[PDB]
Design a protein around this ligand. Structure first.
Ligand SMILES: [Mg+2]
Lengths: 140, 113, 140, 140, 140, 140, 140, 140
């Protein structure tokens, strides 16, 4: 996308054209084989707006003068967006059974916290020091 | 060795305050957050009988004064220097056991004379 | 929405036009793929009113002069609203089985407390220091 | 409701008109998708009266000069009322199975005590310091 | 492939011809017997682009003057790409059942973190000191 | 094979004739009773190339002047190749069920790490000191 | 067999006649009631060659001047060969079910390491001090 | 049998007449109610030869001047032979199911090591101090 997801603030997302937003939505949909095609545009837009807001408020600033967003800000925001869409879908699937066909996934026991609860959030955590408190300051 | 002792006294001769913020495996605390905590616990504005009220997730730890025998290092330095320059150890404001009295003292002062 | 959910107090919510409330309700419905379409408007309105009141009474004020609502206040209130609607619906579904079709979700073991019990509450906890006691005061 | 549930003592509840009570009952019914429609009016009234009494007797007074009901008193009384109605209905449903259709909810391991045993009680606990003993006194 | 995946940064990937990218995609598809043939090209491209960005941002630099990427950089980026494609596919399969036929794989209990959650990520961890903190510095 | 797998670097593998590569592939296929016959040549070639690269980058050098590859280098590389083909096949099978017939294997609980996860990797570990840190150095 | 399996180095195995190898293969096949008859000759030959190499590289040398191969070297190499053929067959069978008939065996998951994983490897371990570190040296 | 199994070395076994070996084989076959009748002569002969070799190499010599084979040497070698034949049969059965008929044996959880894995090996352990280290020496 021309305006990249990391170049866009919450205010900027609201100002983008429908096509500029749709390009970012299209990129987020590349992170799932299903594309979350049965979830409507508004829900995907809400997830991306929420991920942008959450990057800028919870994953901004510094620890010991290191940036708290250590990884690529583009892919962090995309993984955070994908995490949100998957939570809007009801969570991460452990088992799916249909017309005889069944699959179980190795997703269990990931931990209790928000980002630990889906595969996209586990990927987002690596960009952000795994939520560790590396901050330090001095008196002068 | 004198320079080393002086620098070591500044780092290690005095306790230092270590304020740890947040829960272990809890929410991360960032630099701007620690600036506000620094303002509350500043040793510049603290007085001898300041009291602290906190939640459970603030810890006031101490870097202790770490023991080293700088006096013994000074005595060894002064012994090395005085014995090298030929003066008795007493000239360096350093005393030594058993040497201060009797025929031990007589010999060292005789050597000086 | 024009009056954003974070601009609105409990008193202000009661004063909004029906359309102003419906815009906020519509925004909350974006946080689930189902939109909770089988819950009536009054239940969604009650959840939002409750989330507004609970933000202002339980998730306001300061800890060590840091605001207790550290994250984006709009998304915090929307997630708190979504948490409430999902609890009014009976809680978070762990397994669903229908006409042959079955799904199980990675959801269990999250913890004993209110906000830990659904995915929206787990998201909301990240905005509010994860309920940690970071407050400090001095004598002068 | 015009007389709000937080404005009403046990004595006041008994004095209210039938319509004033019905307005409060209607507000409690907004806290479940089912509205507990198969539970009679007398049972909903008994639960609300009991929540009012229990607020004023068990969740009143101060700890270290802080009010023990720290959260919004209206929503606290409504959640306490809803907790009671759900207990009159046999408790919180963990699994429901019907004509082929089955659902399981994330509810287990909540804890041993009264308010921990349903979703509404877990919400109510957040308003009352989570039943923690923060009280302190001095000699003079 | 002529431009090898380790020679290509995020900017370079975007600059490659379609055939140059398709050669690298073809190489990644060799790491699964299924080739992930039901995933579209855009999803495989997104995974590879993301693996490149993540190598350059999270798995780069030095610890005690040792490179953090100790293993072969080509195979590291390919395994990281394969890890991402398998997460876009819904995660690692533990059990698969079809028309009578069933298989269960040894996968579970691998750990909570991102790279531990699929076989390709477990391979990628060996190339990068298993995420251990071997860094050391002196004062002068 | 005439050029043995231990005599071949990653650069050398790329330079071999198709027949020379096929002889090494043929040898790796002897390590499974199935020979992985439903996995294509390119995938077996990718596995062998990856095993060669990984031997030379991760399982090379010394610990206390002892070689880190203590066992036979040919068989170590073949087992590492077999480990990779089995991971490309989806992992180690614990249970298989078909038309009536079922088998379960003793494979579980082997550990969290890459080489622990299949029988070939467990064999390969014995050649490389079981991934233990026996290295020692002096100052002079 | 005339050249015994303990008299043969990896180089010697390659030099043997087809009949001399077949005699040793026939001896190994006596260690299973099934004789692994559905595995081809090349796989059995590869297993024996690998066992010979692994004896000479991993189970040669001394500990406190005791030989590290304490048991009979012929039977050690035969059990090591049998261990490999069983791993090439997919592992040790815990359960087998067919046309109504079922058997379960006391395999019990004896440990995580290579030789612990099948009955033949458990026998082989007894010949090599159970992989214990009995070595000692002096300075002079 | 005339040459008893305890009188026979590995070299002696190879020199015995077919009838002398068959007498010892017949004695070993008395230790199971099934006689292992579906195993061939060569497999029983291999097991006996291996038990003889293993007695003489692993269960010979002294600990504190006490013989390490404390029990009857004939029955020890027979039980060691029976242990081996049962391992060639695939291991100790825990459960057997046929045409409706099922039996489960109290054999489970026996231990990790070779001789602990079948009933015959558990009997053999009692003859060899249960594999304990009772050895002691002095300096003079
Ligand atoms: Mg967090």
């Amino acid at each position: 996308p021309d305006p990249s997801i990391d170049e866009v603030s919450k205010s900027d997302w609201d100002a983008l054209t429908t096509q500029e937003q749709d390009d970012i939505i299209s990129q987020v949909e590349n992170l799932s084989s299903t594309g979350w095609v049965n979830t409507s545009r508004e829900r995907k837009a809400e997830a991306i707006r929420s991920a942008i807001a959450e990057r800028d408020t919870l994953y901004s600033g510094n620890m010991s003068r290191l940036p708290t967003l250590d990884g690529d800000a583009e892919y962090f925001t995309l993984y955070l967006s994908a995490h949100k869409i998957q939570l809007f879908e009801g969570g991460e699937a452990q088992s799916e059974s249909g017309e005889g066909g069944s699959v179980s996934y190795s997703t269990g026991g990931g931990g209790e916290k928000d980002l630990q609860k889906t595969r996209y959030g586990r990927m987002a955590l690596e960009y952000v020091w795994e939520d560790n408190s590396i901050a330090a300051l001095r008196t002068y | 060795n004198e320079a080393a002792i002086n620098q070591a006294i500044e780092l290690h001769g005095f306790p230092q305050r270590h304020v740890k913020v947040g829960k272990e495996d809890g929410a991360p605390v960032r630099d701007n957050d620690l600036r506000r905590v620094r303002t509350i616990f500043d040793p510049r504005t603290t007085d001898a009988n300041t009291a602290y009220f906190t939640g459970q997730d603030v810890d006031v730890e101490t870097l202790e004064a770490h023991n080293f025998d700088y006096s013994a290092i000074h005595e060894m330095d002064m012994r090395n220097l005085t014995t090298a320059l030929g003066l008795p150890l007493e000239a360096g404001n350093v005393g030594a056991d058993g040497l201060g009295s009797g025929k031990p003292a007589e010999l060292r002062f005789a050597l000086l004379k």
